[PDB]
Structure formats: structure tokens, C-alpha cells
Amino acid sequence: NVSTFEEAFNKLLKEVLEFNLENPFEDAKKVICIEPHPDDCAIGMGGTIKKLSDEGVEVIYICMTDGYMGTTDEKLSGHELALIRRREEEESAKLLGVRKIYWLNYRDTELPYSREVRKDLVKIIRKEKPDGVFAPDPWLPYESHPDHRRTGFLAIESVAFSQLPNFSNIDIDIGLKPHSVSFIALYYTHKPNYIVDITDLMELKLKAIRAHRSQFTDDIWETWEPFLRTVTMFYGEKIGVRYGEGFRVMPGLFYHITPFADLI
Amino acid sequence: NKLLKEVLEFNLENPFEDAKKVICIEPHPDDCAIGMGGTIKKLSDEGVEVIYICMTDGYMGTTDEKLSGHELALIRRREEEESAKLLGVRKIYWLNYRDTELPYSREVRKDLVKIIRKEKPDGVFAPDPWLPYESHPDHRRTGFLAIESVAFSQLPNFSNIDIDIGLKPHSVSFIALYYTHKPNYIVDITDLMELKLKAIRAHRSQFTDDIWETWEPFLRTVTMFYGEKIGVRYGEGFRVMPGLFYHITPFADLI
Amino acid sequence: STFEEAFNKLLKEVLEFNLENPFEDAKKVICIEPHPDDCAIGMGGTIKKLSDEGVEVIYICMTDGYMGTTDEKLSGHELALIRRREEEESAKLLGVRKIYWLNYRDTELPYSREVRKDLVKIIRKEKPDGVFAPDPWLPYESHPDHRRTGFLAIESVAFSQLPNFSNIDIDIGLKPHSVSFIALYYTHKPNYIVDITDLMELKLKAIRAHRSQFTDDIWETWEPFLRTVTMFYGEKIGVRYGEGFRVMPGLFYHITPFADLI
Amino acid sequence: STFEEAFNKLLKEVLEFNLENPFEDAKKVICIEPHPDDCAIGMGGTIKKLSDEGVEVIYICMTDGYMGTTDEKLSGHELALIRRREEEESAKLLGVRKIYWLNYRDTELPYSREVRKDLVKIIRKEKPDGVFAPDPWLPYESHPDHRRTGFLAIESVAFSQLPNFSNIDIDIGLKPHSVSFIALYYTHKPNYIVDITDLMELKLKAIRAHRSQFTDDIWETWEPFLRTVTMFYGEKIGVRYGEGFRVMPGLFYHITPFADLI
Amino acid sequence: STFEEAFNKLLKEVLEFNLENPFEDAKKVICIEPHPDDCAIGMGGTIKKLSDEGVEVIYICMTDGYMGTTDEKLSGHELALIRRREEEESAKLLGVRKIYWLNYRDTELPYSREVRKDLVKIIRKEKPDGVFAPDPWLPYESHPDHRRTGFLAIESVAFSQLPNFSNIDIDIGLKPHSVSFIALYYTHKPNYIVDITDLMELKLKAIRAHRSQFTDDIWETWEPFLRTVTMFYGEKIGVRYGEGFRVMPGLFYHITPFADLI
Amino acid sequence: NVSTFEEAFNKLLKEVLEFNLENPFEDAKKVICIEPHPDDCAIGMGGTIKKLSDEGVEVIYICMTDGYMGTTDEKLSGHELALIRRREEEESAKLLGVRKIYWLNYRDTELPYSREVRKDLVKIIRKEKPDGVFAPDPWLPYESHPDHRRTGFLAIESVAFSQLPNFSNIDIDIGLKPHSVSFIALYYTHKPNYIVDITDLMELKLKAIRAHRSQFTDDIWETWEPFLRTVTMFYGEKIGVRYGEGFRVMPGLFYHITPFADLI
Ligand SMILES: [Zn+2]
Ligand SMILES: [Zn+2]
Ligand SMILES: [Zn+2]
Ligand SMILES: [Zn+2]
Ligand SMILES: [Zn+2]
Ligand SMILES: [Zn+2]
């Protein structure tokens, strides 16, 4: 029957998986957007958040850390630099129609890669019963920040595991029952397979990004707007527009032992 | 060139003939069967002693809240024993680390290296940890600890108390990586496809007709992806490089 | 206007960043090696041509090579001496006279904040103009020590700038340094090669000072291999024996979907 | 004014600390056992003296009891399950309904925050008025699970009351909870005893319910030990068989050079 | 001929030890504390009476105070900042200028080589004669950070003495430092008390500085405690108010079956 | 049963447990002495090990570490010292009848307290199947060395865990069968309940101790010798001898939930 692989491949995607990419969000009624440090949802996927906040979809944050380290000022202690930074995200979010932010409070550059941490995200997933999760892609070539790498990993890991009753069993017997999230979307990806048109809202994104004043001196912004405009244009060039934000959405089966998963 | 052919002397033609004993290492109950169940039968038919190592106890492989993890392990242990016999596998070592909680550490290496230094095997099988998009830590960590333990089992100063109780440094011939996206040698499983599925179905906890109805297309499609690459409809794939390509080699992928 | 014009302006005008001789400002750099000899077998030829031109080349050794033998009667400490001496038998013959030994047992190198806090000390100590390390992204690399060494180098360098990372090194006199560049060797993705056919002769020998590692019997498998690597590089820019490394602007190491375009 | 004086005028007067009846105004208590059986063996009798009197009793069980058999033929997985039944059994025979299974394997109970964060969760939900736990300062206690269980209770009772501790609990509608009294079983430093003479053959029956720990051949050694223990305790308050409990000021668990003085 | 005889001729001739006068050489000390306000509470007095004699007193605070509140409004990062402040207006009262902050979050001080590397650092630097730390064998002490600080401190002191321990301190010109003495506050077995009869008012003031901990409602419990503890130590030497320390020869800390006899 | 607790105490000890303390080392053919650092078995135990050769008991060491930190010598490295000390102990052990020494090779001062270690001891116990296991008391007031504390606990934990076929199963799976030790005995204790006379063996014990040259310069032997004699004196008085060695032996049942183990 199945002449070759590629004949069975396209049938496994349309018939079996109901896999689609012109509109993967669409039916989204609530999505948590996971970021390693505060400002990552902004820089990563700010426009697409506003878009999903103009469409009346509920956007919740989980911020892995407290950005305790993002300063060169030999006189501004991380403890407050972090106070400074929970304000700057409470600002940023307010702009983007992000209302809620869970704060995991793990110190910056010290985000563990453990089960403890997975018990945080799995806990939050069974409670906010989110339709999709927005996490950063960990297989981003040359990514050198452990927090980024680990975040996307736990993100996808906690996701697949939240369905699992015997995982963090203490959750089951206090009200929280397993939940099957609908889609996983990987911002900060070098292999996007769905770009959102953000050409328009590309001016509210920098005001959400810059809102983090602590992280953005005007002096350093002299290399970051030239930077951000370069990135967003690369996502746009894939679907012929001025600005773009890129995501990787794969079917749930391709996140595990799928040798051909690099074809979509 | 002069090295592939005339310094190390490796071949992508047939590597398994010289093997009389091999270890097939799997992260969970069934990965041997899903990853390589046909090549498994093959070797056992051809009269080769196939031994499993299971890293973990499955404990987490369910959505049925009535079912405790503890049982699932039991139930899956026997389900594996069914599956193993179905393929000619003789002994399964059970590491027993809890599912989704496989450590990446020396203790765990130290285990693998005990066994390797007892079965003194010619070939080991494992999941390719550089498999792109592998999202399951248990799997990544199995690949890595496998390739690691192997190499290390040769080094008398590693788990140095193993020696003092008999078990000597061994030196496996090959390492074979199933569940890989860079196979450089395939095997024909068109001969034994349906039996494989049967063995893969022996894990009833895992493959309800409902789930199996969704993984039925998957497991056939995969084995095609590999199969096509030779000239058959159904094949299991493998990355084999063994030697000095697993350590510092900027042209490793050219094979 | 387009993606390529914004790309080129980003590098040339916004971030400058060399590519034709990035060791032009160079005076003091560190070569971080997992085991003793990991500078040798990948960076050695490059190390003399820098000790020569004025650069005080500094070493950090991540491990102590404790595990590097087959000899079932050679204690792991015995080996660790053999290697250290053997290493000095190579430090010098390339023009390096300071080797920090971290001292962590071969095959037991932690990937922790702890180790980072060390590197950082040895980076806030010198204030080097550049650091070397193996590329942790070298495909199929199966030895944990290597992978970890790389990753920590990069993360440590970056982190040395932040006053809060190791907030005790500050308070005690050691202040943040902001390293100039980073270079990854042992890479299958170079972008700046370096000429070594002349000093290739010196290298052959410095990679033997570690003769516990490099015996006679084995060498008959490890020199054809060694020549091949030095071919793989060199012949892609001209000569018969060159060495190519990877170097990026500090900002391609974070959130850069277009990093591997170089 | 003396110290002897400035001691009494604190317990009765600054703490209202009564040792006559601490299990008095107690409408819900928690029983943390390191293994299925522990509660029964140190706690057993005393559970009944609370259970039936409208005091709701809940076990937390730290391990799966996976390493309690010297039987080649019994896998730890099967044993774990077996013990669920024996504990489900035993716990009716004492009027306990709810038991949380933490499922940290036998001999591998972590000493960490991650374990605290559980006990802390369960404690905030159930909002009990009392927590029972093994005295972790019991001389010669060899079993880590045992030691750790106590420390981990004491610590989770002090910290259930902290908003900034496990903040995600608050964010999901489980607010702080202060426990009135900590009572340590398996102590040798009691200061309140419990006469359980009529309930003894019941406790032994509730302990014996574990057919995997107390086989008839093991029962010839543990029955005399079980009895001796119970004799050790009660013989202090004039009664034959008793059970012992240490109870202190919440203040006395921290920084007190004289907390030994009760 | 006997034991009691061996006890003394060791103490007095060989180990030249005296309970008499231990602090009579003090030009530099370090007072280590679990939390911010810890050198206060149990040691505030002696410190001032040590500033007086021109002795430089340094603080090392192990935590950031992250978790000292019951009010879901006050957030740890801030609460920390509020506590970094309070111990400066408390340290000044007592001529304490230098305070090292390790920043380990409240209820999370690790027990590791790493945190030893830190205290051994600071100490190889400030090259002091005197280290103070809580008595990690203080009965019923139930705060992790408390226990872990004495052990770590002791271990740390004994551990500066060695070049191989943290040899990167060495390689950047920070040498072995032997310490003269060790004083364990918060002890139930002190053996050399000090006099704070007049100083018990600047005491409640230096402790008072920590108002985010000591609001005036909850002060009405610790008000009898802060005195009572100074009287426990008092009725031991004659004066009205005390601060006790255990001081033992560097030899008794290890393998000494009769440490309990001094 | 019987009436008073004291009566149940005896009855449990004499008849029920059948544990006594006249000469527990008697029926011992094989014993293992566990020491934190190389030289500890010498110091604490020395004499009683010479004695146990002088009868015909095979005596095995497990040395938890490698002494990698035992020097004030600004010049001398750990690596070589660890090499130096594998001799000093081989020398000092041949002067006592000591034939086998297991080197775990944990770095001095860095010995883990973890399953990984237990498994390491459990691998040896099971193999040599000894009747006797020796180790430091870990409840020793003021003992400030993590290795000495940890090594005691891990010993007790390891003796008991050897019996459990579910603990470290692969051992079983390769020959190594469960083993049950007749007794555990704690040196470096301060509640000993049995001494061994070593007065006429003392001098030799010192030769054994001082055979660790690196640890005892002439300058250091000036203080350690009175101390050492002082120690061995302390145990003396108890059995009315010049020099003693203390041990704590307790029934296996006392190491667990016994609120009166303080009483033997
Ligand atoms: Zn970030
Ligand atoms: Zn699997
Ligand atoms: Zn290497
Ligand atoms: Zn128990
Ligand atoms: Zn404190
Ligand atoms: Zn020692």
C-alpha cells in the first residue's frame, strides 16, 4: 500500500495527526508564555503576545528566575536589581495585555535542571489549564546561557509530564488533576516553521522591551535596536513582510524518537 | 580515506558477524523493541546472545490514575519478559532508577561498567543522544551514559573496586546507536515486521488499540524512512562509528 | 532595508568585530584545557606563534588526567604526576610558563556554579584580552569533561563582567574584567584559520611530552589521525598544515537565530 | 531577680505552655512516618486515643518501603505495592482514613527543599492543628530516612507559615498554616506520656498487619522488643504499657542554650 | 600513672591551654553568622567589648534573610534588602565596619566544599586570629542554616591551613592562614563566659535594629528570652549578665573521646 | 509477661536477643576495618589489629579516602601525597598483619554521603562476606571531620544494607549475594562498652602510627604522642590497665528506634 516513506509521511500528518500550521493558535482560549528571565517574553515574542492580547486570549507568564545578575553597577545589589525587575515586567505586561505572572524566583545563572523545578511548572499547568505553552527552543545553536537551555527543556518536559498522574502525585490529592496542553510553541528558534506578521505592532514591542530600563541603557540600546530589527526581519523574510516573530510547532510525537522530525 | 580504510579499518558493510555477545541498552521497558526489535530477532535467530539492560522501571508510563506507579513497573516488567522471549533475548538487567528520574552521573556509569565487565560483550546498543529534538532526558542520558560507560570500562582506574573483585577491564568491538537520525548502515526488517509489532504490542500497558491505532502509522513510517535508504519497505537503522570518532574528530559526520 | 544589508551593518558598523587577524589587540590570553595536553593536540601550533609575537599565553587545566591509562598497576595518582610534569614538558616548548591546575578528577568534572566561580577567579585575576576553549557544540563529542569545559569557559567569561557573580571576589580586591574575544578550538566549524606548517614540527614533539598518553605502540594510530585534522583545516585557506578556530562577537552567544551564518 | 526565676516566668506566663494536656484542643492531626509501619510502631496506640474522639488523623508516608525484605524472590516494586495494602489495612484498624504517599524510595529519602515543599504543601491544605514526627535527635538512630523525616517535619512546620517559601502555593489558593504543637515520637526524651494498656493487643494487631516486616520467625524477636519499648515509656507515669512524646515551645526549637531543661 | 594526671599535663604543658584568658591577643577577628542579626542576639555584647580594645571585628553573613516574614505583601528580594540595611545600623553601634555577604538565600545555605571554598577564601585574606561561629552541636537547634554554619566554620578554619585545599587561593598569592582560636556562641556547654551587665542595653538596641523581624507586638515574647539567655550565662561566674562560649584546643575537635570533659 | 521494665530489659538482652559483651571478637576469622583517611585504622585501632593477626583473623582495610589533603607543605601537591600515603599505610599495615587494603579513592575531605558510597561498601561486604566490621562512632561529641562522621554512618548503613537483596541489585545479578555481618564495632567512640588490653602492644602500635611519616614530623610527634597515650590511658581506667582501646558494640536492633540504646 504505502508506496514510499513520503507517501506515508504526508498521511501520518494530515490523516493521523491533524497537523496544521496556517492557524495553530486560533482556538487558543488561554496560553502561558514561559521565559527564563524577566524580559524574555518581551524580546522573544512581545508582538505575538499583544496580538494574542488584542484577540482577547488570556496570556499568563511564568518567569523562571529573578534576573538577579543583569547589572555592571558595582553598587546595585542583585536583591533589589530583582525588585527593580519585577516592577519592569509588571510594566511590560500591562502594555501587552499580559495580566498574570507566576514568579519561580530561582536566582539568575542558577536555574537548576531538576525534578523540583519540573514540579513547579507541572503544578502551574494543571492549575491554569493552559491551551498552549510558549517556551524558548533549547536546541538553538550556540546558545550559551544555561538558563535559556534548561528553561525550554523543562518547559517541554514539564508539558509532556503534566498529563502524568503519578508525576508530582501530591498535586492529584489536593484538587489539581492532570491536564493535556494542546500545543507547544518554541519562540527564540533558528528553525521557525510558522511566522506571525508583526510589521505593525513592531513599535509597541520596543516600548515593552525598553520598559526594562535596568536592562536597557540608551548606550547599550545603540547595539540592540540595530540588533532586534535584524532578528525580526529574518523571520519576516520567510513570509515576505517587514517584521516577523518565529515559532516552532511540531506534533507531540516528533518530540520523542522521531528521526525525520527535522523535515517540518 | 587512508584512515577509514587503512588505519582504523572499519566497514559499513556488515559489523555484526564477529559478535557472539551483545548488550542492548534501553531507557524504558520497550525501547529495545521499538528501536530495534527486528535486528534483535535477527541476531537471536543467527545464534547471538542478546542481553538487555533496562535503565528504568517505567513507573511513569500511564494516564490511568487508578494505577499506581509501583504496580506499573511490575506489570511492565512482565510485559517486557513477554516481549523479550518474543525476540530471543535471554537475560535482562534492571537498573531500576525511577522513570523520568534517570540521573546523569558516575554512580549510574559505575553500574553499566559493572555489567560490561561481566558479560564482556562485543557490541552494545543504545539511543543516539544527539538525536535532534529528543525531549526526554531519560533518553538523552541513556545514550551518553552508554557511550561513556563503554569507553570507560577499559580504564582500570574507573570504578577501581570492580577489578579487586574479579571483573576485569573489557574492550567492546562496536557501539550501535538505534533511534538515530544519521544511520550509516541499515538492516532489512521486511522479513520480520509483523512479529516486531506483536513484540511491541506485548507492552499492553503502553499500547491500547486506541493508542496503538495512532502509533501504528508512526512505527511503520519510521522503519520506511530507514528502509528506503537501502531498497526495502521496512528497515531498522543504526549509527555505527566505534573508535576514535566518538572523541575529538572534526570530520566525524562525513561517515 | 533588506535582511542582508541590516546584517552587514550590524557587524561592520554596529559591532565592528575583526575576522582577518582578531589576535591584533592580543597581549594576554588563556587557553582552557579539559585534560593536560588538550591545548597541545588542538591549539599548540597556534600557541608558539603567540608566545613569539608578545602574548603571555596562560593555561587553565580543568582536570588532572587521573584516568588516562590502561596499565592496571599504574595508580591514578601516579598517573596524575606523570601528566603534570609531562605537561610542563610542553607548557614551555610553546612559550607558556603559568598553568593553573583546577585539580578535579578526570571523568568527574562538575558542571556547577562551583567550577564557574573558579574560572571567574582566574579571569578576574589576569583580566585576559581573550580566552580559548573547546567548542562544546563539536558534533559527537562523547567525553563529558570536554563538553563541560567548553560550556563553562563561555559562561564564566560572560559572567566575570557581572559584579554579583561571585560577590566575594569583588569585596576582596578582584574586580570585574570584560574579556575582549573568545575562541573555540577543537571545532568542525572554523571561520578564521591560522598558518602552522612551519611550527608543525614543534607540535609533533609537544604532543609527545605527554608520552604516557602518547606511547610508541599507539602513536601508529594517532599520527595519521593527527595529520588528517591539520590537513582538514590548512588546505581550506592555502598551506598543507593549518589550524582553524571559531570566534564570535559576544552577542551571538545569546539569543541569536542567525549565529551559524559565520 | 535570678535565672531560676526568669525561667518559670516564661513557660506558664509568656508561652501558656501546658504539658498536662497538649492533645486537648486538637481537631486534626498529621502523622508523618518514614515507612509504612512507623506510625503504627511508635505512634500506634495514641492514634486510636485521638481518632475516635473526633480528631481526624492523616498519615504522610515519606517512603514506599521498597527495601524491607530479605527475600531473593521479592522485587522492591512488588513489596512497595504489598505494603500499600498492609498500610491500608493497618490504618482502618486504628481509624485513620487519609494517607498521602510521597513515594520517595526506601533508603533514598532526599534531604532537600524539594522534600520540604511537599510536606509543606500537604500541611497547608489539610490545615492540621498538630504534627507528629520522629525525634531526629534520638541517640544511635542509624536509618537516614528516620533522621531526615524528623528534621524535615520540624522544618516544614516552621516554614508552612512563610509566604515567600514555596510561593506557588499561595498563587494557587493554599495560604500559610501555623501548627499549634509539634510532638515527636520515637523519642527518649519525652515530657508527656500516653497510657495505652487496653489498646496494646490492638496496636500489636495493627503493627502485625504488616505481614512483610513481621513474619512469625521475626515475631519472636520483635514482640519482646515491641513490648520492652512500650514498657520503657509507661513505667514513668506509673502505668504498665505506655507511649512517649516530646513536646516543646515553638521558641525552644531555635537558639536555646537551656531548651534541654524540659 | 593515672588518667586525670594525663588529662592535665597534656592541657598545660603540651597544649598550653587555659580557660583563663583567650581573647588577649585580638587585633583581628571574624564573627560568622547564619542570618543577618545573628552575631547580635547571642553575641552582640562581647563584640562591642571587643571594638573597645581596638580589635577589628568583621562580619560574614551566610544568608540574605530572604524568608523572615509572615506578610504575603513583603517580598523576599525586598525583605532581603530591608535586612542588608538593618545590620549596618546595628554593626555601627558596635564598631563593626566590614560585612561580607555570601548571599545564600535564607533556608538554603548549602553544606558543601563550595561554601567552604568561600569562608576559606575570606579567611586566607583577612588573615585573622579569631573566628566565631554557632555551636553546631547545640541541642534541639532546628535551623539548617544554623547547624551548617558551625560545621562549615570549624571545617573552614582547620581548612585554611592547607595549600591543597582550594589551591587557586594560593596561585593568586593568598596563602595558608592558621587561626589562633575558635569561639562557639549559641552553646549549651560554654566554658568561658563574658560580662555584659552594663552592655545589655546597647544589646537590645543592636538587636532592635532588626525591626522587620522585631515589630513591637512579637517583641513581647522575645523580651523575656533575650534577657533570660544572658542570665543562663550569668549565674555561672557572678556578674548579672553573660555571653557564653565553648573554646577548645584545635585538637579536641577531632577524635577526642574526652572533649566533653572540658 | 514479667513486671518491671528492668526485668524486660534483661530478659530481652540475655534470653531474647542473646547478646553479651565478654569477648565478642572471639569467633572471628575475617574482619574489615574501615577508615576515613589512610592512618585512621592505625591510630584508633592499631593494637586490636595486631592482636587479631596474632590469633589468625584475616584483617582487611577499606580506606574511604586517599589523604589528598594531609600536608602544610606549600610546595607539596595532593596527588603525590596520595601516592606517598599509599606506601606509608602499606608499610604500617604490614607491621600489624594487614594483607588487603581497599582504596575507595574519594578525595580526602570530599567524601560523599550518598547511595553511591553505600553501594561501594555493600559491594565489598557481600564479597568478602566478613563476620566483623569496624568503623568510627559517628555520634562522637565534637567530631568535626565530615569524613569521620560520614564514614561511620555509611558504615552502619552499609552493614545493614548488605542483607537487603533489593539494595544494589546488580551485585546479586553477578554473583555477589546478600551478606549478614555478625557484629559492628565502633572505634573512636566515647561510650565504649568493651576494651581490649594493648599495654604490651602499645609500643608497636606507635611504630605503626608513626609509620605515616608525612603526617608526623618530629615537630608534630612532640604533641601527638602525649595525646595518643592520653587517649589510650582514658580507656585504661575502665578495665584497670595502663593502656586501653575502646569499642562500642550494641545489638543490631539498637541502631534503630531504641529510646534506651543509651543504656548498654
Ligand atoms: Zn534571558
Ligand atoms: Zn522510552
Ligand atoms: Zn581530553
Ligand atoms: Zn521505618
Ligand atoms: Zn538566624
Ligand atoms: Zn582521619
Side-chain angles (χ1 to χ4, degrees), chain E residues 14-29:
Chain E
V14 203
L15 281 163
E16 283 180 356
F17 179 74
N18 64 133
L19 287 168
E20 265 199 30
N21 314 302
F23 304 160
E24 208 189 316
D25 326 75
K27 307 186 174 210
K28 189 147 280 184
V29 297

Side-chain angles (χ1 to χ4, degrees), chain A residues 3-232:
Chain A
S3 215
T4 56
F5 166 67
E6 206 198 353
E7 210 182 62
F9 180 72
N10 306 322
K11 173 170 165 193
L12 169 76
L13 296 163
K14 56 184 274 298
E15 280 196 48
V16 175
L17 270 163
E18 293 160 348
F19 189 56
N20 153 56
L21 292 167
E22 287 155 34
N23 48 314
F25 309 152
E26 213 217 336
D27 318 346
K29 283 145 74 207
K30 188 209 287 190
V31 298
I32 305 165
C33 288
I34 312 186
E35 55 173 18
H37 334 90
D39 86 296
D40 267 308
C41 269
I43 306 180
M45 55 167 311
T48 312
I49 295 169
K50 183 63 174 214
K51 210 148 169 197
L52 283 159
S53 274
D54 295 345
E55 307 276 39
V57 203
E58 167 141 57
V59 173
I60 322 150
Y61 282 174
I62 302 165
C63 190
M64 299 312 295
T65 70
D66 57 34
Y68 169 118
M69 301 276 280
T71 171
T72 59
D73 189 290
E74 300 193 34
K75 10 151 189 291
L76 179 52
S77 81
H79 281 315
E80 185 212 336
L81 175 77
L83 220 43
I84 281 156
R85 281 179 88 174
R86 185 189 283 186
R87 308 162 172 171
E88 319 210 339
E89 200 68 295
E90 269 162 325
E91 179 150 354
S92 206
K94 191 182 176 185
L95 293 160
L96 277 180
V98 191
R99 287 182 306 270
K100 202 168 263 180
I101 310 164
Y102 293 90
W103 294 96
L104 262 43
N105 267 189
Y106 290 109
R107 194 157 303 178
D108 205 78
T109 66
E110 290 173 23
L111 177 60
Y113 182 87
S114 67
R115 175 192 53 205
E116 197 189 61
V117 172
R118 282 191 208 83
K119 280 180 182 177
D120 308 338
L121 318 163
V122 157
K123 182 158 88 179
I124 292 164
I125 286 154
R126 293 161 168 173
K127 158 62 176 51
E128 302 278 60
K129 310 183 58 40
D131 285 313
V133 161
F134 282 90
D137 190 326
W139 299 284
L140 156 54
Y142 311 101
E143 182 59 53
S144 293
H145 203 145
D147 291 342
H148 275 225
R149 288 198 295 259
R150 297 171 169 182
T151 292
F153 275 142
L154 299 151
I156 296 152
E157 266 140 63
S158 283
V159 163
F161 290 165
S162 294
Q163 305 173 179
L164 301 173
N166 277 157
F167 188 102
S168 207
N169 56 139
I170 301 317
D171 289 2
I172 273 62
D173 347 304
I174 69 167
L176 300 174
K177 263 192 261 86
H179 158 47
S180 316
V181 192
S182 271
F183 78 87
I184 307 155
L186 291 185
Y187 67 95
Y188 286 143
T189 178
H190 96 289
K191 292 279 159 171
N193 65 164
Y194 174 54
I195 307 285
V196 169
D197 200 302
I198 64 141
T199 299
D200 309 278
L201 295 149
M202 177 64 179
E203 284 298 318
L204 175 57
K205 194 190 171 190
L206 307 180
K207 218 190 191 171
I209 289 161
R210 291 207 35 89
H212 296 263
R213 294 140 190 93
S214 57
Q215 292 301 115
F216 282 101
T217 65
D218 321 61
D219 190 6
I220 294 188
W221 183 265
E222 312 270 282
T223 49
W224 267 75
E225 192 189 39
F227 177 68
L228 253 148
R229 303 255 179 194
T230 313
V231 183
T232 48

Side-chain angles (χ1 to χ4, degrees), chain D residues 162-226:
Chain D
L162 305 184
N164 303 106
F165 179 96
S166 197
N167 47 226
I168 315 301
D169 284 335
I170 324 311
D171 296 311
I172 70 134
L174 300 190
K175 78 184 207 79
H177 176 60
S178 322
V179 190
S180 336
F181 75 89
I182 288 171
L184 300 155
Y185 69 106
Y186 286 137
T187 179
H188 75 309
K189 284 269 162 212
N191 46 187
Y192 166 83
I193 309 285
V194 177
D195 173 299
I196 55 113
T197 328
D198 270 296
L199 316 90
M200 254 295 288
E201 213 62 26
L202 168 59
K203 180 197 182 171
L204 306 176
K205 193 209 172 156
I207 297 167
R208 269 228 46 139
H210 297 258
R211 251 146 214 103
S212 59
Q213 310 308 134
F214 310 85
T215 64
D216 279 310
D217 217 6
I218 273 182
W219 190 239
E220 309 165 20
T221 320
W222 272 67
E223 158 150 41
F225 170 72
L226 288 200

Side-chain angles (χ1 to χ4, degrees), chain D residues 254, chain E residues 34-35 37-38 146:
Chain D
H254 197 35
Chain E
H35 290 73
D37 87 326
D38 257 313
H146 274 260

Side-chain angles (χ1 to χ4, degrees), chain E residues 160-224:
Chain E
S160 318
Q161 278 193 140
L162 323 157
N164 287 141
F165 191 100
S166 204
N167 90 120
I168 312 300
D169 279 10
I170 279 70
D171 298 326
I172 71 167
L174 295 154
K175 266 85 86 79
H177 175 71
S178 295
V179 185
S180 303
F181 77 92
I182 8 62
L184 322 174
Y185 54 101
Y186 284 106
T187 164
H188 80 305
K189 291 275 162 289
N191 59 172
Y192 171 76
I193 316 269
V194 196
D195 163 73
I196 49 153
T197 308
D198 315 322
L199 294 98
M200 255 277 288
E201 298 308 315
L202 187 64
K203 193 160 198 177
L204 308 190
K205 214 278 125 184
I207 306 164
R208 270 271 55 266
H210 299 268
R211 290 188 183 88
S212 52
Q213 297 320 129
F214 300 115
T215 57
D216 304 302
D217 158 23
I218 248 174
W219 175 275
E220 306 300 324
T221 306
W222 280 46
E223 178 197 313

Side-chain angles (χ1 to χ4, degrees), chain B residues 34-91:
Chain B
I34 297 164
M36 50 160 307
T39 316
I40 297 185
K41 186 63 185 163
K42 180 277 192 72
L43 301 170
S44 273
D45 286 354
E46 260 273 76
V48 188
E49 202 194 338
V50 180
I51 314 163
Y52 285 1
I53 291 172
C54 202
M55 234 65 67
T56 67
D57 62 27
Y59 183 112
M60 306 276 315
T62 204
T63 103
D64 180 8
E65 314 160 46
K66 312 189 275 286
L67 204 41
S68 81
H70 292 317
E71 182 166 347
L72 188 47
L74 219 39
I75 293 198
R76 297 187 70 183
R77 185 191 294 271
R78 302 153 172 182
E79 283 178 1
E80 181 66 287
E81 289 175 303
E82 210 86 276
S83 195
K85 191 201 208 162
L86 281 177
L87 304 164
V89 176
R90 295 188 230 305
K91 205 197 307 167

Side-chain angles (χ1 to χ4, degrees), chain F residues 19 24 27-28 129-133 159 179-184 249-252:
Chain F
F19 172 78
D27 322 5
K129 327 185 79 162
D131 304 298
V133 170
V159 196
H179 176 68
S180 312
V181 163
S182 296
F183 71 95
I184 315 147
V249 187
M250 295 194 305

